[PDB]
Amino acid sequence: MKMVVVIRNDLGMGKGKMVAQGGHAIIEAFLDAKRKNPRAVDEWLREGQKKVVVKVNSEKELIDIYNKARSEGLPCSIIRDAGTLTAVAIGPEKDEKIDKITGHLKLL
Amino acid sequence: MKMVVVIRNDLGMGKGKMVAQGGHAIIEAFLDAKRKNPRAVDEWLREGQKKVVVKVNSEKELIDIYNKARSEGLPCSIIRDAGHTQLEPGTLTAVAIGPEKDEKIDKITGHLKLL
């Protein structure tokens, strides 16, 4: 199992901000998943809570990835900074259900 | 309420690595805070789960920050990243302290520079 964190690379966010924004994404996706399948989330935690960080190059692309996750019915989240949408996170979920969504994205 | 994420800046970690390692720290401190003070976590979440990311430049300082947080009774975590190459040991990459009252957390990490 794994969680994929999607960070926008076109916003010019600094290292600290990407960690914080991805950070909000991670917490929200985790909670979204835990509220739906706590048992799967427990497994993800036992195996090392694997996370993979990928990037998208526009807000439209960030939103597309998120909509796709929601349509597939996967745990996910989309973050808005204090204004724009900065990041998304999908999972934890079985690796193949997530790769379906973000498999083509490049690593941050 | 706020959570401070401490990232090592002397390990040559790339942007993605930092988000991931910080991510493991954030999750771990969160779980620790949930068992040590559920109510405070809810408030943090309601208020937009503010997170501030600072940096340290050695394992020593990372550990000291973690110890200081434990010695203060604050929820926290310290992460170990499995070995780069089978020819090198894993490393302590990040620490997360909180969530908890801003005052308390600043008492411990206030002097750290933003990442």
UniProtKB/Swiss-Prot annotation, chain B:
One of its GO terms (molecular function) is peptidyl-tRNA hydrolase activity. It catalyses: an N-acyl-L-alpha-aminoacyl-tRNA + H2O = an N-acyl-L-amino acid + a tRNA + H(+). Its EC number is 3.1.1.29. InterPro entries: Pep_tRNA_hydro_II_dom_sf, Pept_tRNA_hydro_arch, PTH2. Transmembrane segments: none annotated. One of its GO terms (cellular component) is cytosol. GO terms for biological process: translation. Pfam families: PTH2. Keywords: Cytoplasm, Hydrolase. CDD domains: PTH2. The keyword Hydrolase applies. It is found in: Cytoplasm. NCBIfam families: arch_pth2, PRK04322.1. The natural substrate for this enzyme may be peptidyl-tRNAs which drop off the ribosome during protein synthesis. HAMAP family: Pept_tRNA_hydro_arch (MF_00628). Belongs to the PTH2 family. This is Peptidyl-tRNA hydrolase.
